Ligand binder design. Sequence first.
Ligand SMILES: [C][C][C]S(=O)(=O)N1N=[C]C2=C([C]=C([C])S2)[B@@]1([O])O[C]1[C]([O])[C]([C]OP([O])(=O)OP([O])(=O)OP([O])([O])=S)O[C]1N1[C]=NC2=C1N=[C]N=C2[N]
Ligand SMILES: [C][C][C]S(=O)(=O)N1N=[C]C2=C([C]=C([C])S2)[B@@]1([O])O[C]1[C]([O])[C]([C]OP([O])(=O)OP([O])(=O)OP([O])([O])=S)O[C]1N1[C]=NC2=C1N=[C]N=C2[N]
Ligand SMILES: Nc1ncnc2c1ncn2[C@@H]1O[C@H](COP(=O)(O)OP(=O)(O)OP(O)(O)=S)[C@@H](O)[C@H]1O
Ligand SMILES: Nc1ncnc2c1ncn2[C@@H]1O[C@H](COP(=O)(O)OP(=O)(O)OP(O)(O)=S)[C@@H](O)[C@H]1O
Lengths: 542, 542
Amino acid sequence: PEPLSYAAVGGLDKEIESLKSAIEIPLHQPTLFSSFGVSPPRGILLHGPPGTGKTMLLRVVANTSNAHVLTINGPSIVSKYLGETEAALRDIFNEARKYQPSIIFIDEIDSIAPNRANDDSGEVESRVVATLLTLMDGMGAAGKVVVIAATNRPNSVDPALRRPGRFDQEVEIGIPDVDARFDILTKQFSRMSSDRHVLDSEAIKYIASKTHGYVGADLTALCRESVMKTIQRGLGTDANIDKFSLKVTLKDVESAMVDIRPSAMREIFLEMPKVYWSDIGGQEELKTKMKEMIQLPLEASETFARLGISAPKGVLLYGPPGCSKTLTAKALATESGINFLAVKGPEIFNKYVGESERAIREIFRKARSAAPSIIFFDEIDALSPDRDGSSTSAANHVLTSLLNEIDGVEELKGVVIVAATNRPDEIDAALLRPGRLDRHIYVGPPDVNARLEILKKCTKKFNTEESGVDLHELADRTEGYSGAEVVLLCQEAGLAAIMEDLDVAKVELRHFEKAFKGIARGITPEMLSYYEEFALRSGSSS
Amino acid sequence: PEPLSYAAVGGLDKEIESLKSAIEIPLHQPTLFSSFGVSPPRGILLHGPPGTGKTMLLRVVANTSNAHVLTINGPSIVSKYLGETEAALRDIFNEARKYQPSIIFIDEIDSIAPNRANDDSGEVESRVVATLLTLMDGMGAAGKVVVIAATNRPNSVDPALRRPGRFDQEVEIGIPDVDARFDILTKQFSRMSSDRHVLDSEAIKYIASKTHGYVGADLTALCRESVMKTIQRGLGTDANIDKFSLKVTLKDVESAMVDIRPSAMREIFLEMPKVYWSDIGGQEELKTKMKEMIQLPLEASETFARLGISAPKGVLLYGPPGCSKTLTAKALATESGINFLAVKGPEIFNKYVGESERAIREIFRKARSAAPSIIFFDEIDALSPDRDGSSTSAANHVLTSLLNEIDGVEELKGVVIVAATNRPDEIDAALLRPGRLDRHIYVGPPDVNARLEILKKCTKKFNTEESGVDLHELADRTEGYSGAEVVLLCQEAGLAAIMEDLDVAKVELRHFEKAFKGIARGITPEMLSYYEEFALRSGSSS
Ligand SMILES: [C][C][C]S(=O)(=O)N1N=[C]C2=C([C]=C([C])S2)[B@@]1([O])O[C]1[C]([O])[C]([C]OP([O])(=O)OP([O])(=O)OP([O])([O])=S)O[C]1N1[C]=NC2=C1N=[C]N=C2[N]
Ligand SMILES: [C][C][C]S(=O)(=O)N1N=[C]C2=C([C]=C([C])S2)[B@@]1([O])O[C]1[C]([O])[C]([C]OP([O])(=O)OP([O])(=O)OP([O])([O])=S)O[C]1N1[C]=NC2=C1N=[C]N=C2[N]
Ligand SMILES: Nc1ncnc2c1ncn2[C@@H]1O[C@H](COP(=O)(O)OP(=O)(O)OP(O)(O)=S)[C@@H](O)[C@H]1O
Ligand SMILES: Nc1ncnc2c1ncn2[C@@H]1O[C@H](COP(=O)(O)OP(=O)(O)OP(O)(O)=S)[C@@H](O)[C@H]1O
């Protein structure tokens, strides 16, 4: 029995500190809030997607805090009929009250008081929510009691429990980021002695990098699976190997990766990978314009206010498919340092009725929470009201929610909305009017310098100068290819290289010639003329 | 009471070894990786389509493991009300814990804790899932207890029992393949003495070949019916035959097949028959091209990585209806030696809203699991968003799932997606953009050499050279035919042969002339123009 400690928790140090404060300020000294004449906040609710580390945090709070732990075991104290159940829970609260200081732990409130939905059994669920409200109505500002709550989904909890003055302090324990994933991995692999874990910190970098979707508990599972497969490699050599100290290795960790893949973020707003400005080929004009028109307003708020001008509220990127738009937004995300929440088009539109408006609401709330922030909307084309009557019940509602959140700049100061599209017309004109998503930047097919840069980025691994191919004739021969077609031309050239030989280490011009014959232009002059005719009708930066 | 052994199980050797490993490492050697610091797995799940051999596997594991088995008999220990039921299951777990080492068998979790669906009676189902989780929360890292549970459909089980750090380890027992079917039949017919079973191993090969949809129990059922129909023939000669040792013959086994088939396999991800490169008439250019751009990337990954190019992810086969597309894909499957998941177009798009999402997610999970693999999407034309508002609820969701899943290059190193559409224009352009299903290959009507080879393959059985018909005048006379049209020309010639005589063994040019009169070209110049037009608009390998 090793008692847990805050060193065991990982990747949540920010909200670890927040929860520690929300426990220490009450439960150790309510006199402070007695002086300031507000009822002390009784009730901290730990949100979070499943497996993020709630229950572990509750256990570590119980172990670390010197107060007395009490538990509402959900069903495990509710009796057959509620007449004894309500008495039992009141008895729990009273026993906490007599032995102040005390903490009441409620796990899985969704399994206790979800009375908003249809599953509210008036004999059971309504009674439980009623008694929760009734006793939560008072424990005494002088009382040294606190209620802590953990739910895998908050909105399932009825709004009645989440009214203010009830348990309403909130700690949003969320999906770990890349650095948080590294923290969790380092702690987990330090739980085992470093002898058996032969992975240098660079290996942990790598495994954290390839564990995008994984959340919390999942990572421990990964480590556990690694153990198993390591043991299996001990048996794969010969069954007679009963010797211990078989090291766990990086290769074992991917071999585990391929098989664990449990429930984690695949229906959550995407955190995109890391790309720098160097990866993007040229387009220095667009790079400068984006750097300015996004990063500068978020880092010049005092200067903008001094000048009597509101900051730009929204920039819309439009260009032929393949040209660097998602990559440019990702690069801005990676090396602008601003919090950057991105959502694909369809992944928010589908979001069956109500879930769409809720999703827009929560994305904007999160954007406001961690200001300054950039909300990236890839393919606004999805959120288009330009369809038949079926769109009136889905597209119109989401469009008007987006409009209502976009406007009202008084509450929007550290938020910039960057949208991307390849079908600019089908973006409802109510969203490209002045005062709204109004700056329009046209990406367009890359110019010759940018194309040459893309070549040099993608042709570097296979010999070019000492293979007799000069990239400039390729660059001026590939006029009109969108950047995707340029990188595909490089890929097809490599495919010809492996065509002619399995272990070749050299790429000739004839391979590029075959590739260039094989690839067809994807940007017809129709599409170009389309984009300038949208440029004339545009609002800003035509 | 014959004791079950692993010799009785068949066609699951890989899964058998995995389960034996997952039962030996705990339950015999907990210390051997309690040192490693991770919590032991402690709870393994056996998936499987109904009748694929779960319950037998549990019985054999019980009868071969020296620990003591305890059975949660589902309802057979659940009482009238859950107050005694939860106590009884706690008592079961405690009696296991005291008598370490112990195994706890849960059969049909779905009949126990399916609380994710509407059939959750909060008095029963919620209580049972709650007591599971609450007791699954702790068994003791040194507690030599293991849970094994089996389900007929996993997703019906809630995510709560399938969180990690929990009842986690999964063993997938699937529909047996052809070789596994041979193994199961060999074991079944060797259970009965070889005297009664007069079928040489070749006959067993044949019967396994023509039992595509049969799974597991079904095959045993087949044997039963064989027995039954065999003794029916014992009564077919004369009722006085009470003599034993009536051999079971092959013909009896097919006569059983015509009746045994229940609804065991549904529109499951399809396994396709075997066709060799020799079967496909000519098309040597397409032979080489497909061989390279599919098999070569999946077998020279290190060379591609060394060269700085990503392997080609997707090949779309577009050709007129009749030319060898599905046949070419099947040939690649059969004699490329790579795992070949393949699902038809209409059988995934038109299932349901969430069912389609789940289908694509699971097909790609399976493709990743057994890498390298080739996902074949025959007739993506079904997955088309080019319809009315009804497509906004079905087509958009399925297409965005496909795009999101195929854009995951970071963990998609050993998968290639091959598609085959007969009208390529109705594929959403987002699925043919570079970086996605992008290499386009045109199959097209067979050239003269291919037509000659097709004839030679289909005319071999009935005499051609010594019948006075030379295949080259046929070959150059049948310009414009699709390959299917050519094989049907051969079939119609045979039909005229059996017209003019019931037991003929000779086909003359006049029969072919009648057939050639009776066949119209299904490949209009309009269709060839359409395909050339899509070629000029394509992305790669135009
Ligand atoms: C790993 C690396 C990362 S990245 O770069 O991003 N990538 N990945 C993978 C792949 C590729 C390609 C291929 C063929 S495969 B990559 O490279 O990609 C990239 C990007 O992504 C592209 C484009 O995209 P975006 O951005 O999106 O564009 P768009 O199309 O416009 O949008 P949408 O959504 O579609 S409307 O491409 C590429 N790149 C690179 N670099 C570059 C490019 N492009 C252009 N330009 C340049 N510079
Ligand atoms: C038994 C043998 C097997 S198979 O070959 O496959 N078959 N079977 C049956 C039959 C036939 C015919 C008839 C009239 S009856 B068979 O032969 O078939 C075959 C195949 O299958 C066909 C074609 O297919 P595909 O590929 O699929 O086409 P398409 O349309 O493209 O697809 P889809 O689905 O529609 S999109 O035909 C035949 N063959 C054979 N060989 C050949 C052929 N074709 C062509 N070519 C060649 N070489
Ligand atoms: N930093 C961490 N974040 C998350 N989980 C962690 C972390 N460090 C260790 N873990 C392990 O992850 C698991 C977390 O379990 P839980 O706390 O039950 O997850 P969860 O948030 O409770 O999911 P629920 O209770 O179903 S909403 C435990 O096995 C911990 O040992
Ligand atoms: N190798 C084998 N694979 C599958 N079934 C086999 C095999 N060998 C024999 N069988 C027979 O298959 C039958 C299937 O029994 P079960 O294990 O109950 O099937 P099942 O998996 O339990 O189906 P469900 O999911 O419980 S409805 C057994 O009774 C055996 O007689």
